[PDB]
Amino acid sequence: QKLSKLVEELTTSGEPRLNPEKMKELKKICKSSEEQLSRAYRLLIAQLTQEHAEIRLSAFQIVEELFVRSHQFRMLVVSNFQEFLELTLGTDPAQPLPPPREAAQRLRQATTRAVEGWNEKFGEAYKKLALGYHFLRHNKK
Amino acid sequence: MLGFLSARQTGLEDPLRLRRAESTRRVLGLELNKDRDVERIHGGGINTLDIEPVEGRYMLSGGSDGVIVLYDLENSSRQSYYTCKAVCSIGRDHPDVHRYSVETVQWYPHDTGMFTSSSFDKTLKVWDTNTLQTADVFNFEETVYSHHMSPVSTKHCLVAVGTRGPKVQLCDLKSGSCSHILQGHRQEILAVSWSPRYDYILATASADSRVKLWDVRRASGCLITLDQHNGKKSQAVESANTAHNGKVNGLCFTSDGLHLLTVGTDNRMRLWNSSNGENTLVNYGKVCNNSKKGLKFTVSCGCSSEFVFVPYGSTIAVYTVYSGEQITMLKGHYKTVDCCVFQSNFQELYSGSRDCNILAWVPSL
């Protein structure tokens, strides 16, 4: 719906840059209804699973901004988020063989910095962020 | 629960009913408690955990980094949130610390003052918990995959040790004799487990796809060799009578010791009659293990229906032992799960993994 419209308007790689007005509109829409974000993750898995690395970066940034801002993606990334733990363990680490890793190295660095930020941003009881960061630092950063 | 309380209060139902039913409900409601943590002390993956059998207060943990950690599992703080603090630790600076991976650690049954731990440095060390010093060391000619002391023998205090050699070493902690060998396997023994029922029954599983039950008193070889088919494919025993179609890397007797659970690298778990080694044909589906070493898995105790918690990749798969129905998968680890250990007092689980973490699973509500 409108979630998909905003996802298309933002993830488009023809203008691959962070736009604040669209992101604040998405934040306000997600705050208006929690069900906006539960399908948004499904949209983001579309963008993470897409061929273009810029779309993956865009969907990662959208997920991060919804988790840190909307207060509805927080209840997806810091509660009922084993999908998020597995996507963190599969994104930076090697994709499970035979399937190899398809993201770009700049996207790996962006994910590393996002994990380092989220270690302190929301870690009141979610320590698997830090545990995954340590595993990366000792196995496939 | 109120019906259960009233039936217990009025004598309609035995209190055993409420204990077993509520314990079963708690096990089914087992979930990753972020309201409890285990202090991270291992620099490497935890290969083994062992909660003491008496009082279930303290836990041992052996890592691939060669260190041993001794944790307190009781909430000594008044808060509802606490961290299972590390009481002691055989660290990198302890003169007796293991040079390589600690693959198994076991509390001495019948008392908390002693515990034994085996490593790929080809040693089984006996530690005095109080002094935290080695009391004895058993060197072996080849790396140890598993050791086990009988949880039940008030008479003998043998440690069954399985190494890469085809022979099973029996080491007497009572005055030291590590010469006895049980021969009959053909490849590395990846798991050893004494029966909890019979003092002298030892089940040993090896990479040659065979599980053998021995009577260590007996001087005439294995009692029984587990057979997948029970006779449908029958051959003069030189290569047949395999428990699994790969390496058998895990053993666990059920609580009463009347059945044996074996997990092998054919991605199967089988349930066997421990008296005549007959496969019970419990399905269990597919149990993913590709471990190249021993796989430590446990069963539940004191519930209405018995459960088995088996490491399933990065998760812990929970199955009903006598029906095969997979209860659930506990998903909280980031790398492969190497060992899980059951706290029977409160139906709690602790699982170690290659991600250098020990996760506590507590029943929810």
Swiss-Prot record, chain A:
Outcome reported for the amino acid change (mutating W118A): Impairs transcription-coupled nucleotide excision repair ability
Stretches the record annotates as VHS-like: 1-141
Compartment(s) of residence: Chromosome
Basic and acidic residues compositional bias, start-end: 1-8
Effect of C30R: In UVSS3; mild phenotype; impairs transcription-coupled nucleotide excision repair ability
Region entry Disordered, spans: 1-18
Function statement: Factor involved in transcription-coupled nucleotide excision repair (TC-NER), a mechanism that rapidly removes RNA polymerase II-blocking lesions from the transcribed strand of active genes. Acts as a key adapter that promotes recruitment of factors involved in TC-NER. Facilitates the ubiquitination of the elongating form of RNA polymerase II (RNA pol IIo) at DNA damage sites, thereby promoting RNA pol IIo backtracking and access by the TC-NER machinery to lesion sites.
Subunit (UniProt): Interacts with the elongating form of RNA polymerase II (RNA pol IIo) during transcription stress. Interacts with the TFIIH complex during transcription stress. Interacts with ERCC6. Interacts with ERCC8. Interacts with USP7.
Disease: UV-sensitive syndrome 3: An autosomal recessive disorder characterized by cutaneous photosensitivity and slight dyspigmentation, without an increased risk of skin tumors.
Family that this chain belongs to: Belongs to the UVSSA family.
The protein, known as: UV-stimulated scaffold protein A
Organism listed in the record: Homo sapiens (Human)
Gene giving rise to this polypeptide: UVSSA
UniProtKB/Swiss-Prot annotation, chain B:
Gene3D superfamilies associated with the record: YVTN repeat-like/Quinoprotein amine dehydrogenase
A GO term for molecular function: ubiquitin-like ligase-substrate adaptor activity
WD-type repeats, residues: 33-73, 88-129, 133-173, 177-216, 235-274, 281-321, 325-363
Subcellular location: Nucleus; Chromosome; Nucleus matrix
Entries under SUPFAM superfamilies matching the protein: WD40 repeat-like (SSF50978)
GO CC annotations, alphabetized: Cul4-RING E3 ubiquitin ligase complex; Cul4A-RING E3 ubiquitin ligase complex; nuclear matrix; nucleoplasm; nucleotide-excision repair complex; nucleus; perikaryon; protein-containing complex
Pathway entry: Protein modification; protein ubiquitination
Keyword tags: Chromosome, Cockayne syndrome, Deafness, Disease variant, DNA damage, DNA repair, Dwarfism, Nucleus, Phosphoprotein, Repeat, Ubl conjugation pathway, WD repeat
Pfam families, per database record: WD40
Matching SMART domains: WD40 (SM00320)
A GO biological-process term: positive regulation of DNA repair
InterPro entries attached to this UniProt entry: G-protein_beta_WD-40_rep, Rad28/ERCC8/Ckn1/ATCSA-1, WD40/YVTN_repeat-like_dom_sf, WD40_repeat_CS, WD40_repeat_dom_sf, WD40_rpt
Function: Substrate-recognition component of the CSA complex, a DCX (DDB1-CUL4-X-box) E3 ubiquitin-protein ligase complex, involved in transcription-coupled nucleotide excision repair (TC-NER), a process during which RNA polymerase II-blocking lesions are rapidly removed from the transcribed strand of active genes. Following recruitment to lesion-stalled RNA polymerase II (Pol II), the CSA complex mediates ubiquitination of Pol II subunit POLR2A/RPB1 at 'Lys-1268', a critical TC-NER checkpoint, governing RNA Pol II stability and initiating DNA damage excision by TFIIH recruitment.
Disease annotated for this entry: Cockayne syndrome A: A rare disorder characterized by cutaneous sensitivity to sunlight, abnormal and slow growth, cachectic dwarfism, progeroid appearance, progressive pigmentary retinopathy and sensorineural deafness. There is delayed neural development and severe progressive neurologic degeneration resulting in intellectual disability. UV-sensitive syndrome 2: An autosomal recessive disorder characterized by cutaneous photosensitivity and mild freckling in the absence of neurological abnormalities or skin tumors.
Subunit organization: Part of the CSA complex (also named DCX(ERCC8) complex), a DCX E3 ubiquitin-protein ligase complex containing ERCC8, RBX1, DDB1 and CUL4A; the CSA complex interacts with RNA polymerase II; upon UV irradiation it interacts with the COP9 signalosome and preferentially with the hyperphosphorylated form of RNA polymerase II. Interacts with ERCC6/CSB (via CIM motif); promoting recruitment to lesion-stalled RNA polymerase II (Pol II). Interacts with KIAA1530/UVSSA. Interacts with a subunit of RNA polymerase II TFIIH.
Protein name as catalogued: DNA excision repair protein ERCC-8
Gene of this entry: ERCC8
